[PDB]
Enzyme design. Structure first.
Site, PDB file in Angstrom:
ATOM      1  N   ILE A 233     -36.106  24.358   1.439  1.00 19.55           N
ATOM      2  CA  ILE A 233     -36.841  24.993   0.369  1.00 19.55           C
ATOM      3  C   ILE A 233     -38.295  25.046   0.820  1.00 19.55           C
ATOM      4  O   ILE A 233     -38.761  24.145   1.523  1.00 19.55           O
ATOM      5  CB  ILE A 233     -36.670  24.207  -0.954  1.00 19.55           C
ATOM      6  CG1 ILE A 233     -35.197  24.218  -1.387  1.00 19.55           C
ATOM      7  CG2 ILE A 233     -37.542  24.776  -2.052  1.00 19.55           C
ATOM      8  CD1 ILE A 233     -34.849  23.234  -2.500  1.00 19.55           C
TER       9      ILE A 233
ATOM     10  N   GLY B  21       0.789  -1.234   0.000  1.00 19.42           N
ATOM     11  CA  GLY B  21       0.000   0.000   0.000  1.00 19.42           C
ATOM     12  C   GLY B  21       0.819   1.280   0.000  1.00 19.42           C
ATOM     13  O   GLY B  21       0.551   2.206  -0.779  1.00 19.42           O
TER      14      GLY B  21
ATOM     15  N   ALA C 144     -32.952  19.633   1.524  1.00 20.06           N
ATOM     16  CA  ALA C 144     -32.468  19.700   0.156  1.00 20.06           C
ATOM     17  C   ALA C 144     -31.620  20.947  -0.078  1.00 20.06           C
ATOM     18  O   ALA C 144     -30.724  20.936  -0.924  1.00 20.06           O
ATOM     19  CB  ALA C 144     -33.629  19.672  -0.803  1.00 20.06           C
TER      20      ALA C 144
END
Lengths: 543, 543, 543
Positions: free
Chosen positions: A386, A194, A426
């Site tokens: 909203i 790695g 949202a």
């Protein structure tokens, strides 16, 4: 010596002198900030080895390497407390963020060699992808200070495999390269598998004389006698950590970067009002409103601000500002009740922090204008969502929120998001939220921030409404749960926000972001060919 | 009626008739397969509502919607058992995969309305991103069969926020659109907030007469009287689920797609040897070798195969094959001991499943050749890693593995990866692994597959070596752990591999992938301008 | 069955019934048109061989091949009279334009085998580049009907060498392919060298049984026994010209294309007012004004038009219209005096056909809005330039014209330009002029069109002013020169405008362009995510 002073200099000034300071509010913010700092301190010191012990063995710590590399006072850490998988040491075993090296902003990733010599741990691949993504979006050099022993055998299943695991960053490094973004690695200690791939994937390999990189008193595979003398993969070798850093500095000095003066529209100027007032201005009482203009005044140059479509979509502020003389587009929520708003309702009051038709359209347009002008966007979120209901739906609110997403995706410009307080619903997404993986470089939050789908009580009242004291106990449990899982530290621990920063650090992060965005932009709009200033002007003069 | 028959027809044939069948091996594979099928059955039936109950209420199930939509026998599910966050129902509440609609391959995502009416659950955003990514990479239409009630209040923190949470797919849908990839949604039931954005983000909105989409006996916000009659966001409305499906079919019929004949180099031909032999050929005994040519013979057209650089890099097979007459590049591990190999060692035997200098270079070249020729790559992994040690390091193995990553990233072509058996070490990554997020569309595995960083005993012997019976007990615990966490079902549950498929399903998935890649490719290399066939020929004739 | 009827259907209608027809004006336009048609007839019949003679020898003419290939009534020729180098036959030896094949629009190039068997002639490479560029911009298949004997020995220096000579189209064909745009060649007769490369560069090679292609009673090099039987480069071979055409039709049927219904916002509708009125509406008297709305009414669907920012920048019309149900953005000059305009001058009258600050900004915005919405632009030019003087300069007119160029370049959308009458000054450039090589697919003009840097008298008065009868004779010579070199036929002969089209052909060309742009667009904006309609609405309702 700047273009169009009539548009870009002597912009309307904003903000008032702080007449009524609030020590209790300041006390509350700073205690969140103190907790953040304390946790970071603790997380940086956690591990199996100390800075002292490493130093004796010949190794600098991540932070010593970083501090050796960067110009003083320019470290802007990100993901400091990112730990979604609950690693016991509280980190992803890397330290990452923005730093400046002899004037050039770079993205830095440093293995934490206090913790199983910078081994792969759960959450680390994700953390690393956030780093390469930021570098990609900003076309900004990526620097590894690498000290990575690879996989821990107990937890390989969580770090080795899958689409976004230990193998992704090596592809991410190739993509950066193919995009013309250089990756520079200082290679420390033992890097098998790695770490080996973390060592080989970059553009430039600077090795420590005792370091090694490999696929997997016999010498550790792929030491200097091999990768310097034979393969030549180690381009330069140095005696010690500081030499490696200076090697890195040298290759960074080689990198292309604008003198930012090229893009300035003005002399860099400090804000006219002090940032320390933000501690009084931004209320820890989430029910209290504040004047967003007072925040914008303290984060941007000379408290200047050139507003786009003032009076239209009064739930939002959109306009141009300057950061060290450079143009940014600022999009910020307005707090407070909005009389006779919104326009598609009768006798109504609008709630600041919410999005309505005009603000959404105004934002769509502004993003699109800034996109065309190649002006990077800074979003200041304090939002509760909203507007809802069939009047909101007839006003196209759903389609307008999505239009904004589309507009953002269309911008293809690096963007910063700063959660001033509320990141909810949202609205968090559409307001240049971190969900725009092509655009949002990262996000930061203040000590006054909080993240949820919806408020605790809203969720509780929603799920348990159909109970038509123990149920009220379940509801209040959920409310407290939502509170627990929406605190700044928790949010950053899960990576909902990348860093919680002090009120006095917000502008610095803005300065780091903006200067990094303009360091080597991939696209230019000459100032005299910019549309945003013109359309802004025309709205002020025509109506 | 095809280009260059001399190159692309009557290719060398491969494989032998299966003379010695192995019923016990077949029994073992099929029991993995049976378990997979049983788990999928159970996961599809799990939830709070049954197919029967939904049907009565007027709703088809996900699978009924899918089966109604697609050409019979073309469903290629992916992520069937994907459940990294351990949701109790065993799924991410969506059903996804490839399906064909009147001849056009599409990517399908269907909300599972048995499970809290297709609510957001942990792991779902990730699952959805795998769907949009596949659609992006293949330039293939994305179809939502949407029935999404949004966020569950108990677990919002795991599904609502963050870079790759419930908000990402709406940006992913905008990106697809901006890339010219259409998204088509059939909208069922109640879709507030999360479902609302899933409804509005697509290109085409087909609604059920009783469906709704919204930001958030009063009618549910954003019903047909609103989003059909007022906003016009619902482009078409239908009485029932099947009507919506037929609406979807209609818009799919509108979509651009090649007649695949355009890209064929030959009449589609079945393999000459039957796939059922794979049950004997591919050994469940992970210590036993097999002839990869016998696998390739059973997956590709007419058991034809045109090998690139046979004899060079004998640890790998790279060459061209045909899938329903279409050109693919195949890259597959060779099993068995390789005498006098590799070349940089003296008196050595090479292990099939491992990567050496020549195979890596050969693969680098082949990927690059196929990239230039716009031939999609299918990778057949059975790998134990890249050769280790300083002789491997001097042979540039680390740099060559990374070169391959770079080559893959450079290809910018959709690629399929099939784990025949072993997916381990760095080799899994570099062999067109799922870590190449720009290229690998998804990955599939056989019942004989297994995924780990390294074998259990290797990890155990590594971590406990420095014990110079209870320690041997810890070692064997780790070994059994590694076995547990590397079984086909577990690997697919974590999404290490997207689907475990039956031996008789591998070619079908290859057929689905290849036909989907050629359906509407974004780049063409005319056959007479292809380099791979020429360089392949030249190697055979020149040396 | 269309999105947002409230925005896209029942748009404001425009135009009035033609109450006062002008037969003399109509007579004048049609005489330009007759001359164009006569010249084309003559140029198509010119050469060393006739249609009759070719037919007997087994060869169809270019036009017979085209007419055999295309759906009746869909031929939209371009560059018919393009002949910048004054070839004696009056053409570039190719016939090119847009044609529809079983509903799919394609770009067609046919060698004129009447003229030295379709040899390279001066101007031909340029003509061919205009064809590949159009195909590129529209992502539209390119079809060669090839019959090319290569270079004529007398004039090789004008056709063989250089950046944009006979060798460029072979690279242009590779680029088309790499962009995923298929090239299909029907190969006729002898094609050595230049024709050979024209034969090999396409994606699909359909050969005539007697045709050949080659690098350079012994058979002509590279006949069917070679390129079918040996190389396999000829994918299909046919007995005769019509078979080759049908082969071509077959491969075209294989090509991806939307059913245009996907992109329609309405049923295709004819204009409400007849096009024949354009012959009265558009004045051949260049001093006379007209109502542009009367033109727009006759070219676009149902005489519907949705104007962007009506009243702002009244020198320009910008707005949305429909072409066979498909969305286009229309940008057209307004004629007539404009009282109290422009706004940066006192007591002034504006001249229609000129550009001022508001029209430029309005256009900048509209292009940018349409760019974001992926709505292709149709420009209707009747222009005399941008306002001049230091008041114009202070109004930023130079920077705004250039901003528009930038905006256009930023759009990356296919655009059509139609010169209604005057194409003059910088205005011709900035109004989606043919100088935008990335955007303007081609340009067309009416019989009333004329092209110059500035009017004859302006140029004469400018160059000779400093004469402070023979000089007045030089001035009038220059004026007549400017008139000569600005007539529709001359302008198209030099390729200033690609085709002069009849008034009744303008909408058909618009229909051909628009349907070709939407046939297979590379980028989509879903209708509900479009900004132009919303910003347009908001301007009408907010001010």
């Amino acid at each position: 010596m700047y273009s169009m002073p009539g548009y870009f200099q002597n912009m309307p000034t904003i903000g008032k002198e702080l007449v009524n300071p609030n020590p209790e509010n300041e006390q509350e913010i700073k205690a969140v900030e103190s907790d953040i700092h304390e946790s970071i301190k603790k997380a940086l010191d956690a591990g199996i080895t100390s800075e002292e012990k490493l130093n004796e063995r010949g190794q600098l710590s991540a932070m010593q390497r970083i501090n050796a590399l960067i110009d003083p006072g320019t470290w802007c850490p990100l993901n400091s407390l990112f730990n979604p998988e609950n690693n016991k040491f509280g980190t992803t075993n890397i330290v990452n963020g923005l730093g400046r090296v002899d004037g050039k902003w770079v993205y830095i990733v440093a293995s934490d060699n206090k913790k199983m010599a910078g081994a792969w741990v759960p959450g680390q691949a994700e953390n690393l992808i956030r780093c390469s993504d930021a570098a990609k979006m900003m076309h900004l050099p990526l620097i590894y200070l690498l000290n990575c022993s690879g996989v821990e055998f107990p937890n390989q299943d969580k770090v080795y495999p899958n689409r976004r695991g230990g193998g992704t960053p090596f592809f991410r490094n190739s993509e950066l390269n193919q995009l013309g973004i250089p990756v520079i690695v200082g290679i420390y200690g033992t890097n098998p598998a790695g770490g080996g791939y973390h060592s080989i994937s970059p553009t430039i390999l600077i090795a420590h004389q005792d370091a090694n990189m490999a696929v997997g008193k016999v010498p550790a595979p792929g030491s200097v006698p091999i990768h310097y003398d034979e393969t030549g993969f180690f381009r330069e070798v140095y005696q010690n950590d500081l030499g490696v850093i200076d090697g890195i500095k040298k290759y960074i000095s080689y990198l292309p970067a604008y003198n930012l003066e090229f893009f300035r529209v003005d002399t860099p100027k400090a804000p006219q009002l002090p940032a320390e007032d933000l501690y009084s201005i931004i209320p820890m009482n989430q029910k209290r409103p504040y004047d967003i203009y007072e925040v914008i005044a303290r984060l941007f140059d000379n408290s200047e601000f050139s507003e786009y479509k003032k009076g239209y979509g009064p739930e939002m502020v959109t306009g141009l500002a300057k950061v060290n003389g450079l143009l940014v587009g600022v999009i910020a929520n307005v707090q407070g009740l909005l009389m006779n708003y919104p326009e598609y309702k009768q006798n109504s009051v609008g709630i600041g922090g919410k999005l309505y038709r005009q603000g959404l359209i105004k934002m769509n347009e502004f993003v699109t204008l800034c996109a065309r002008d190649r002006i990077p966007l800074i979003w200041l979120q304090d939002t509760t969502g909203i507007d809802v209901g069939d009047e909101a739906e007839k006003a196209e609110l759903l389609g307008l929120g999505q239009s904004l997403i589309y507009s953002i995706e269309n911008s293809k410009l690096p963007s910063l998001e700063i959660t001033i307080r509320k990141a909810s619903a949202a609205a968090h997404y559409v307001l240049g939220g971190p969900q725009g993986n092509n655009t949002n470089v990262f996000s930061i939050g203040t000590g006054a921030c909080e993240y949820y789908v919806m408020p605790g009580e809203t969720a509780a009242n929603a799920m348990y409404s159909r109970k038509l004291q123990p149920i009220i106990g379940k509801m209040n449990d959920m409310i407290q749960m939502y509170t627990d899982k929406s605190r700044p530290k928790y949010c950053t621990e899960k990576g909902m926000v990348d860093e919680i920063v002090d009120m006095t650090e917000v502008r610095p992060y803005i300065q780091a972001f903006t200067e990094a965005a303009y360091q080597n932009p991939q696209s230019i709009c000459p100032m005299h060919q910019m549309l945003t200033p013109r359309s802004t002007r025309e709205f002020e003069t025509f109506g």
